[PDB]
Design a protein around this ligand. Sequence first.
Ligand SMILES: Nc1ncnc2c1ncn2[C@@H]1O[C@H](COP(=O)(O)O)[C@@H](OP(=O)(O)O)[C@H]1O
Ligand SMILES: Nc1ncnc2c1ncn2[C@@H]1O[C@H](COP(=O)(O)O)[C@@H](OP(=O)(O)O)[C@H]1O
Lengths: 283, 280
Amino acid sequence: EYYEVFGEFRGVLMDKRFTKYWEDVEMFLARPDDLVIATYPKSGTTWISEVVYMIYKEGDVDAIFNRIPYLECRNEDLINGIKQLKEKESPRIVKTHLPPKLLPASFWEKNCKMIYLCRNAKDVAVSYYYFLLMITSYPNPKSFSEFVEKFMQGQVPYGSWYDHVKAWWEKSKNSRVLFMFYEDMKEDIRREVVKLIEFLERKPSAELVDRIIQHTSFQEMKNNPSTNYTMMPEEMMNQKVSPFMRKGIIGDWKNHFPEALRERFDEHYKQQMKDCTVKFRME
Amino acid sequence: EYYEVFGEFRGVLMDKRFTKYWEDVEMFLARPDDLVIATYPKSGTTWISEVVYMIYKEEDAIFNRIPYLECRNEDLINGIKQLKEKESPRIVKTHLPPKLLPASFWEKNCKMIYLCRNAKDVAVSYYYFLLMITSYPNPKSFSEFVEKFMQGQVPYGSWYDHVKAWWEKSKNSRVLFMFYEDMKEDIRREVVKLIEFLERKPSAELVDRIIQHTSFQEMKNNPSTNYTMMPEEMMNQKVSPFMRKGIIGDWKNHFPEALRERFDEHYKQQMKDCTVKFRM
Ligand SMILES: Nc1ncnc2c1ncn2[C@@H]1O[C@H](COP(=O)(O)O)[C@@H](OP(=O)(O)O)[C@H]1O
Ligand SMILES: Nc1ncnc2c1ncn2[C@@H]1O[C@H](COP(=O)(O)O)[C@@H](OP(=O)(O)O)[C@H]1O
């Protein structure tokens, strides 16, 4: 059952396997040069992770989940992201989906640089729906509408999308925390890549920016076994049900939200984000 | 499908995930002080592994403390990688017949321990293992599985060829040969023998500690050794538990009269000229 698999932890619904040994996350030790990449699930985490990795390697083309460990991921003794990080050489790149109040405090104390990425809410809901169908140990939603009712209530893994975006937007007041959008990478990739190269204190030569653009397109990454998640067992992630690199577009909500549901969602959204100044792209 | 999952490799039926990158196993580099623990599947590997570990030490999972050499599942599981990062002295687990073991182990004259169990009881234990592993097709019936076992058409091949080849290798003083039934009927003697082979001093305290920590009851309730630290998506113990019965003679509850006579007759032909001594 749904609530046998997921449980509320300090006000946030979570996979019980990731909270059984919470002490290991709470007491994590950060290093001054660690870089944190944070996102709400299904907002483009894999895409921006590959872009940053290429920058670290000066455009020189192991699975991505080994090169950039998923911090809180844990499944008893078979999978352990904290252990992977303790054995990783500096400078480390860290992936997470946690809201600010649950992130290890050591990261704030050492003032580490961080990058936060978001995507428009309706398109996130469609992508997250297919993800639950893909993960074998997660109960399949009865219908898309049923899933959306839960999304609006914050009753899905990692909690409320609204609370997540608003809290991280507040944190981005700091010059060492960069805030970005999926739709901006889609409509103006060259500008977004140059911005990332400069934030990471490197030089944006024309040759470098070009290698990155060609290597990280949707067509390329869909055929790259290192980034398309085929290096992960079908017993856990069944891509025959739904592929990881699905569509990669803006606007798929138009093929899933019935008229009546869309109006209720948008109305609810306005009340939740009323006083938030974040600037999403007109689409 | 059975043959979509398994394929013959150099005359031995194997899980295709363990042979896709065979070069990594073939070229493996051994160290002079490495110790190899070898067995045919379901003969008591976990039991003797814990005994040897306690000896070395005078709670991470056992599959992390003692890496499974040829085990591989793309980039999620890799036993060779685990061994390259392990500090000496290393303890290595394997189910490979002598002709497939990395040659570096023979070249450096490493010490090894081989363990076996009577064939009929191995067949019962292996049958439940296939039901437990989610990615392995469930046999239609026990009899169907036994027909395949006699033909050597199960993972890791012929049990008969495996035991006969390792018995010949045990002529070497650095390769110790042991039996599951001897550990069951005379544990104190088998433990003292292992302590001496590993060049350590057998004492009252040491032998008794190991005896009580390695009983079937103790290991069944130890999360480090009962395999509950391994995902249910891969190993479903609701179908059948890893620490199942732990006895001698369960074949009496599974083999019909007619099948037993055919099996024993076949066994005779296969083991005709082998001097190995199983317990009555
Ligand atoms: N290079 C790329 N260009 C565009 N979209 C990409 C991409 N790489 C991954 N994606 C998309 O990012 C989403 C996965 O997000 P995450 O990595 O955070 O889990 C998927 O969305 P869709 O399901 O809408 O296709 C996926 O197709
Ligand atoms: N301490 C112990 N005492 C007795 N039997 C043990 C044991 N530890 C494991 N076993 C048995 O060894 C078999 C598993 O073998 P392996 O370790 O090679 O995979 C199982 O046999 P059964 O299925 O007959 O119960 C299991 O119960």
